[PDB]
Amino acid sequence: MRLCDRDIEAWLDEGRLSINPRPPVERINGATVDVRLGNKFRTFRGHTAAFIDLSGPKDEVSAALDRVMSDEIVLDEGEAFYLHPGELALAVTLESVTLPADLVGWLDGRSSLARLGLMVHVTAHRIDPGWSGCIVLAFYNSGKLPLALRPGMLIGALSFEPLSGPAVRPYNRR
Amino acid sequence: MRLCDRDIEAWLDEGRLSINPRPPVERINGATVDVRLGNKFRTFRGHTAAFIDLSGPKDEVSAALDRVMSDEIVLDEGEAFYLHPGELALAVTLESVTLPADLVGWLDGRSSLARLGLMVHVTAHRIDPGWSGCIVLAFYNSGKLPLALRPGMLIGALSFEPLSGPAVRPYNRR
Amino acid sequence: MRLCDRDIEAWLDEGRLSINPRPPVERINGATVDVRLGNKFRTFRGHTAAFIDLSGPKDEVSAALDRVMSDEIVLDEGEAFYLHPGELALAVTLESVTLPADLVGWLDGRSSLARLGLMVHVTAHRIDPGWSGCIVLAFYNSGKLPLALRPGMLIGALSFEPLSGPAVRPYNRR
Ligand SMILES: Cc1cn([C@H]2C[C@H](O)[C@@H](COP(=O)(O)OP(=O)(O)O)O2)c(=O)[nH]c1=O
Ligand SMILES: Cc1cn([C@H]2C[C@H](O)[C@@H](COP(=O)(O)OP(=O)(O)O)O2)c(=O)[nH]c1=O
Ligand SMILES: Cc1cn([C@H]2C[C@H](O)[C@@H](COP(=O)(O)OP(=O)(O)O)O2)c(=O)[nH]c1=O
Numbered sequence: 001m002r003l004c005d006r007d008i009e010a011w012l013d014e015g016r017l018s019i020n021p022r023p024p025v026e027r028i029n030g031a032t033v034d035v036r037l038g039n040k041f042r043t044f045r046g047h048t049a050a051f052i053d054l055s056g057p058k059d060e061v062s063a064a065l066d067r068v069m070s071d072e073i074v075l076d077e078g079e080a081f082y083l084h085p086g087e088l089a090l091a092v093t094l095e096s097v098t099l100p101a102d103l104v105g106w107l108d109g110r111s112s113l114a115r116l117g118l119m120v121h122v123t124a125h126r127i128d129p130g131w132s133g134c135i136v137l138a139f140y141n142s143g144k145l146p147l148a149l150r151p152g153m154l155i156g157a158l159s160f161e162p163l164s165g166p167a168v169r170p171y172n173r174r
Numbered sequence: 175m176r177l178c179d180r181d182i183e184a185w186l187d188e189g190r191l192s193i194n195p196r197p198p199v200e201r202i203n204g205a206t207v208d209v210r211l212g213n214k215f216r217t218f219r220g221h222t223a224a225f226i227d228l229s230g231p232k233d234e235v236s237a238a239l240d241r242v243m244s245d246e247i248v249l250d251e252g253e254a255f256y257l258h259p260g261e262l263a264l265a266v267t268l269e270s271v272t273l274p275a276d277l278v279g280w281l282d283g284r285s286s287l288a289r290l291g292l293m294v295h296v297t298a299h300r301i302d303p304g305w306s307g308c309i310v311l312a313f314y315n316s317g318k319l320p321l322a323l324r325p326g327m328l329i330g331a332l333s334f335e336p337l338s339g340p341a342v343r344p345y346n347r348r
Numbered sequence: 349m350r351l352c353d354r355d356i357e358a359w360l361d362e363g364r365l366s367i368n369p370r371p372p373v374e375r376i377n378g379a380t381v382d383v384r385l386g387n388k389f390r391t392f393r394g395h396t397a398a399f400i401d402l403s404g405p406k407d408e409v410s411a412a413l414d415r416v417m418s419d420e421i422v423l424d425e426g427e428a429f430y431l432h433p434g435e436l437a438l439a440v441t442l443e444s445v446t447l448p449a450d451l452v453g454w455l456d457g458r459s460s461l462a463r464l465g466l467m468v469h470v471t472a473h474r475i476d477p478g479w480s481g482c483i484v485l486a487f488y489n490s491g492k493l494p495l496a497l498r499p500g501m502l503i504g505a506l507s508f509e510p511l512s513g514p515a516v517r518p519y520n521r522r
Contacts, residue, residue, distance in 0.1 A: 044493070050494075051494040053498075055500070065464075123466065123469075124456045126505065129352070164352055168353050
């Protein structure tokens with residue numbers, strides 16, 4: 001059962017859930033905390049590789065994945081990242097997030113950006129008990145026009161669901 | 175923890191969750207209420223704009239978004255909407271939905287349409303405590319062939335999860 | 349509220365949730381059971397049909413869908429299935445899954461494959477109370493390069509949420 005907004009504020013106070021920087025009350029509502037776009041991106045350069053073998057020898061995998069991914073792109077103040085129709089790109093939330101062993105996060109993108117084509121990371125919704133860090137975001141433009149994305153914009157909504165008990169093998173321990 | 179079918183029927187009876195028109199027992203099963211496709215659509219006309227700036231000056235934004243979106247398309251009885259491969263379109267559920275401050279909805283599309291390419295709105299699953307209205311749907315054809323969509327068809331499944339208490343800032347109040 | 353890893357192990361022991369073959373402790377962590385890719389695939393052959401009418405006369409529907417879908421593709425040991433950019437394909441989990449009437453499953457794909465383009469089945473997350481069987485997976489490559497998928501690879505994560513009571517009309521009974 002999701003935490004309502006005021007229980008989120010509670011868990012943040014007790015020190016049992018951490019979100020950094022801490023979002024003000026404006027950005028905690030209903031059952032979600034709004035999260036923000038960070039300033040570190042990546043694109044793909046397919047030309048160096050014929051395919052990616054997901055389940056294969058971690059040698060060739062490491063090095064193939066090293067070829068295909070752009071170097072980190074960091075945008076100066078007031079600069080957009082243009083995500084063109086049909087492009088997949090990686091970015092990161094502005095906020096860091098630390099979950100205890102008895103809470104799981106679910107990240108949704110914003111419905112109003114998805115109406116213009118933005119699918120964020122959408123084969124995976126789940127932030128694990130124990131997770132501590134930024135969240136890697138995978139964007140895909142499924143609309144006709146390019147979409148300009150600026151660091152600081154609202155990019156998603158985080159909701160939190162207590163588990164039936166504290167996980168034995170959370171992220172930090174395993 | 176999701177409401178099972180018979181608790182959904184309960185909450186609808188107590189007057190604590192509203193779905194309009196009210197779906198019969200056929201369309202409430204397991205842990206979901208089947209929802210239906212409405213009769214109001216939109217497509218994109220990119221030609222008037224170079225991009226969309228999501229986080230930018232609400233003036234230019236309003237007017238850019240005014241250009242790019244088709245006018246409302248309403249289908250006469252017995253008429254299909256053809257969603258061609260690679261097209262993003264907006265539609266609406268037939269049913270209206272009103273949630274109390276201590277319940278959150280999650281909308282999934284139907285697995286059997288997704289097997290033919292239909293991604294519905296899938297960067298966002300969440301209907302907020304306090305939401306009252308139709309649900310805007312964003313479709314994308316990810317398959318090879320066009321898909322004919324007729325108002326009244328089953329288009330999704332709504333499930334409901336009580337919150338840990340009533341939200342302080344639900345949709346209606348904020 | 350999701351089952352943590354050790355409650356999943358409990359429900360599997362009590363005989364109240366079944367996953368076959370049973371995954372070892374390595375593959376149950378936090379709040380999910382890792383699931384594996386099976387060895388039965390399908391692709392599309394659009395050339396025989398102009399469109400698919402989802403909501404139409406189950407005669408023509410059966411036969412149209414019979415045309416468009418490839419025959420079952422079964423991969424010999426050590427063989428990949430190449431899913432090319434922009435292709436939608438169907439596969440199946442290696443594990444079978446049987447849920448009781450008071451538990452609902454949610455399947456997420458893996459975040460690390462989605463970073464390379466793999467959207468799995470993502471308009472639908474939900475395994476119903478009463479479901480018993482393999483899970484049909486719908487893949488879509490949203491990246492630049494083809495992705496090689498081998499039977500046995502990790503393909504997803506299953507999490508489980510008790511309902512507010514046992515469903516009256518679960519999958520097996522309705
Ligand atoms: C997921 C979804 C939500 N909504 C509704 C439910 C939410 O309560 C509300 C807002 O969802 P939200 O994801 O917060 O998007 P936004 O950027 O508009 O705030 O809109 C839809 O109309 N359609 C959808 O497909
Ligand atoms: C989400 C998902 C569900 N299922 C199963 C689980 C559900 O219990 C069942 C039905 O899901 P549902 O979304 O109701 O699709 P449909 O139009 O076939 O009724 O199929 C899959 O086989 N694969 C999937 O990827
Ligand atoms: C869904 C999501 C998860 N994560 C985090 C949360 C999870 O705790 C963790 C692992 O998610 P998981 O789906 O298990 O992917 P993987 O193949 O890497 O194990 O990564 C992200 O960084 N970004 C995301 O978009």
